[PDB]
Subunit: 340 residues, 5 copies
């Protein structure tokens, strides 16, 4: 993700104009190759019409170009493109909101799993590691970046997210389906074990912890659902066909015809169709943005920073439940305190 | 469902162009027959106009074609089609999100229903089987795929989802309505029975399990509501009438008229209306996608994989609450552990 | 409601074309009278122009028809109609989702209100009857079908939904406002009374039951809000004025003018304006669908089946909490059971 | 609010046509003055053009009118108006849904705050009065109708919503901010006091009551947020400028030009621009509806009936928790009862 | 924020026309510089065409202006602008709703943390200060106004939001990530410490307080997500390019051409393009409003009043949990009381 929120805090003269100079995460970088191909095809066809074709062939080409320019409006580019982009964008934000955070879980684990000894620290750290492991498992199922970071479970073990004993237990459980849900069952059973050993005071606090665990599970299930249930392939095919056919038609219909023939709309020959290239910029770019957002867990510049989030969650959880377990600053009177 | 999320992780040159070559779940496969019918009708009418009709009849046909092409724009195809498709798509995703998953229930059942003996295993397995049975019952009510898998309750018994004793009890209960809610009542009563026998420690954990059961029930009720309350038939009729009438008009108005008559827009005779066929592709295909998504629980290529989900849920639940009941990996110090 | 979900499970050739032959819940049945009136008015005006008017009067009529056809596009029919229909449709589905179901309540009442004796059965049945009575009261407030079924409270008593003692207590409570909330207070007080008599084990289960009761209340309040707060009358008036004025203009502007005058667009006289009648079908039908959906609790073919839902809820609740209280099938090993 | 839901239950011939005859809450009543001003300005300009201007001045006016009519389409009236109206309407319904109701609170207070003596009645009545007082305070902050009913806190005291002792305590608390949140703190502290005196059985029921109180608070906070955070003034200014400039242009561009000059579109002189007046009706009326809905807590005919809701809530709450505390109808066998 | 809700309570003649006279938070103030630049460029080009260019150069300029005016409609300004503005507006309101309020927390802390002595007051005040500190930390991360108020943590200490001991503990915790979550862990641990010392009666009330704390955390996480995940830069670049290119084209295509050349649409020379300047007002202003709303936590006139909210929350929380802890008005009979 290329964040620029702080740069656009205030509406000033040209507060978006500076953002046009940026290359990382820009429309130029996404549209470079398609734009170059389209421009080269247009100018090759222009050179063929201007230098190669004879008089009769130029007349035939002019008729074909008038035909294409008139009937290319039958292609409902904006109709399909707007629907497709709205669907992509809603799914994009919903997918961000489904990424699990350990903060709600760690607040309860840090304060309700008692014991400053080695066993209490082990329990709190293991619970946090199980929750983070569920998140890691589903993320590497749904994200190519995370999967390239952890191409096998041995990589997960070498990163300290899973112990070798947990890896052996994980592999001993036989299931022909995705095993991201295993650490949630491990978490619930460990929490109940902590409760039965006196480390969790009572079943209200245990149930609060289990509720947060199930909330985390539901987040992972939403990630799984957006990965599994992609946008229907028919929509993707239709929208790319619409854009591509419209600009293939424009490759002929937007040529600069001979001004001596006095065709309507072809009175001035400027050689470069600035407005056609602009229209390509807008529509093709709209499609390319949809192409980048359709899976926001890849390695695009604007895709979600999933590996960074994994690192942050691990470090913050382990610090919250180990370093900051019953570790409070000294209670003192604040500035606004008033004596009785 | 034809998932392709991993293939479009990164926005590259033509990241959607490869998807155009796929046949399963494609627009081509959905639109094949309608496209063939439309093309055949257009070319039959073209041959009648070109070879059969005389001069006066050709003149009458030309007038009719100008009339049809001018006044076919009174048909608000995109107006009705966009609304209908937006409604279909919102209902499609909402229906996916209403499919019940047993994970939240199984996390609590695996850890809070005590006993490593035969009776504890029987209790946990039976509770999970009841929840899965409710999901199966509503799914076979709402899904033709699941119904064809389980055409009667005897098929449900033979698949191990229901015991013969449970089938006899199920049939003994007399109700002129859908009986998918029975296993939820069975689940709540069994959970209370487990609590009264000491298998559930206290009523906070019992209430947590019952809350998850009621959440599952609400999912099943949402499935029932989307099945029962279909999109109003009036909308379906209006939208199909709009598409069909528009392209029936196009069968006449988009013919290649005689260029010698110098009709405006009929200067070039290309025999094949490429842009009319494209417009059919887009609009008719938009309707066909709506036809495929209107009931996403059928046997379309892009419909939900309900039988697979049933299998996954059953296997995962039974493993979670039986194999993984109080079965934790050895607690050990993680990689990031620091000594005091 | 006319459900057809099972008929459109799979996308086939013409999967919507069969639905065009249905009359119940169809656009034809809703639009019959308006279509007949519009067609009769058009043909009466056509006969006046063709047979009654003289030359000067025909010329004046032709000028008026050109004027009306040109300036009827100033009426933004689709602009207002799309907004009005989107509002109607969102409110329609939200109103369906607000209809209360007793299943969540009955799951807890069946399992947590103890006693197989007469008093336990009386308690469970009375609690379910109170919840169903709240739903019935709000439904007969908001639904003309339910109100015609129960035109007074005596009809509610004769249907077994309310006892005569409960009717006397209900009438003794003096309130100048809608009394649908009374049975919820009765339910909460009876549940607390059951708890105080030992029939509910503890206050966690009591609070769970009260939470479900309050969830039910909120559903009834949403029904009350959609009934009370109708779509602003200004919108309804504006949208009907727009449709009616547009087609009143079309009654003149869409007449077949004399082809000898060579008016642009009036070259061919077909006597029947097929595309004008189609445009009436689509726009007027869109309005009629809004007219049918604006109150989905009436007696339209596509309105909600509220009386059937009342019957289903009553029968299912009473069976759940009486016949199926602590009445479980024999626990037995399932098909997938494995011995230790 | 002008409710008409019962009148449109069934879709019949002209089910909206009757609503056109209503004056209260109608578009005619909202648009009367603007329509009269627009019509008078149009006819004054028409009289100036027809009777006062000379030949050269008429020619200049005709050129200006052609210019204005052609270039007034550059004003994107529907673009801005549709967005503004959608925002207004979403905020309108969200504001209705944020109005607090005491029913959920009163169900718990009536059944869980024990004691049939004077002190129990005082406790229940005072708790309900505190919750209603919070709602009243926020409503008079956000509603001009409620504020005109209660212009000072003395009016609130004289209406029995607040006792004089509570008014003295309320004024003794010093805060430079809105004090609508005070009675919620009072409610929570009184509920805990009732619990500590044995009037609330245990802390699960106390916590349920506090949860409902916090739900009520959140409703009041949503009301506060919609009042504080109005629709951005820039949007309101832009949309009114767009409507006003478009119809100021129409005051010139829609005049009936001299038919002898044979201007295109000015062939027939009807003196009254029926379609221009219709277009004013639709667009200006759309803006006026937005003007009425932007603050639905005023004194418009279609604004929310806030004073009536206040009265209803007070009476119903006091009856629920005082008259109907442990006051149940006699338990008896229902009509469907079956003996063992 | 410039609130004007009270001024538009009632729909009257010109209820929006007064708002046009306001300068603070107005479209004029946002669009002043861009409008001046556009107007100056247009009139400079007009003077060049009218006074500097010769006959041939004027003819070339006229051809270029016809070309630009015809082909500037290929730029889909409204298509991209409407999508971008809808996304901005949805994110704007969602960001307001994510701002944390301490009221739900303070209601529970004021009533459930016992003790009128110094230690009870210290506990309640410290808990409220921790929750407010979390909100302050995330706000200064996401808001330039709050960050300019508190440029370092020393400023937070000097404002009484954090004690120097808490600052030393805060800095001793080592984390390469944003530390806004620290005070939530501190809050949970302090609440558990209060519970273990007898200040919180039992674990149901403790869990209620922790649930409200986690709700607050989730609000802070939503703020963090909207700050981190900005609107994709590609969209911002595309939309600003579309607006800027369209009006750069209008700088040539909307010039007043020589009326003697009888170009269609250039019959009247008024020197000032009133409708072009209006179209700039609407479209450019629409973009500027998006520029102001894209980060509503800045220092714009219409941005959220975050510093004021911080002040209000601090003062109200400290008063709620200290001055109003077990401090209730005298219980007395209300006006509507009836004796038995
Ligand atoms: Ca991507
Ligand atoms: Ca299907
Ligand atoms: Ca109806
Ligand atoms: Ca108002
Ligand atoms: Ca800003
Ligand atoms: Cl789940
Ligand atoms: Cl339900
Ligand atoms: Cl309610
Ligand atoms: Cl709040
Ligand atoms: Cl969070």
């Amino acid at each position: 993700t290329v964040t620029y929120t702080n740069r656009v805090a205030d509406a000033r003269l040209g507060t978006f104009s500076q953002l046009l100079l940026q290359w990382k995460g820009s429309i130029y970088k996404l549209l470079y190759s398609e734009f170059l191909i389209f421009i080269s095809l247009y100018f090759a066809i222009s050179l063929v019409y201007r230098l190669i074709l004879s008089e009769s062939q130029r007349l035939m080409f002019e008729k074909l170009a008038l035909y294409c320019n008139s009937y290319a409006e039958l292609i409902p580019v904006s109709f399909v493109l707007g629907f497709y982009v709205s669907l992509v964008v809603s799914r994009w934000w919903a997918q961000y909101e489904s990424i699990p955070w350990p903060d709600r879980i760690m607040n309860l684990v840090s304060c309700n799993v008692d014991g400053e000894d080695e066993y209490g620290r082990l329990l709190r750290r293991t619970l946090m590691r199980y929750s983070n492991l569920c998140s890691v498992l589903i993320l590497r199922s749904v994200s190519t970046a995370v999967y390239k970071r952890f191409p096998s479970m041995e990589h997960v073990v070498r990163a300290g997210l899973m112990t070798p004993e947990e890896h052996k237990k994980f592999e001993s459980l036989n299931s022909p389906h995705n095993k991201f849900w295993i650490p949630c069952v491990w978490f619930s059973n460990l929490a109940v074990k902590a409760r039965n050993e006196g480390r969790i005071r009572d079943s209200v606090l245990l149930q609060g912890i289990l509720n947060e665990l199930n909330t985390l599970r539901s987040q992972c299930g939403r990630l799984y659902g957006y990965d599994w249930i992609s946008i229907p392939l028919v929509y993707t095919q239709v929208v790319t066909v619409a854009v591509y056919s419209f600009f293939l038609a424009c490759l002929i219909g937007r040529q600069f015809l001979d001004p001596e023939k006095a065709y309507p709309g072809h009175e001035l020959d400027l050689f470069v169709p600035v407005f056609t290239f602009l229209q390509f910029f807008f529509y093709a770019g709209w499609l390319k943005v949809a192409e980048q957002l359709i899976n926001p867990f890849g390695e695009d510049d604007d895709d979600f920073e999933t590996n960074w989030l994994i690192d942050r969650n691990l470090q913050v959880s382990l610090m919250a439940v180990d370093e900051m377990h019953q570790d409070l600053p000294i209670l003192e009177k604040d500035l606004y305190w008033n004596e009785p």
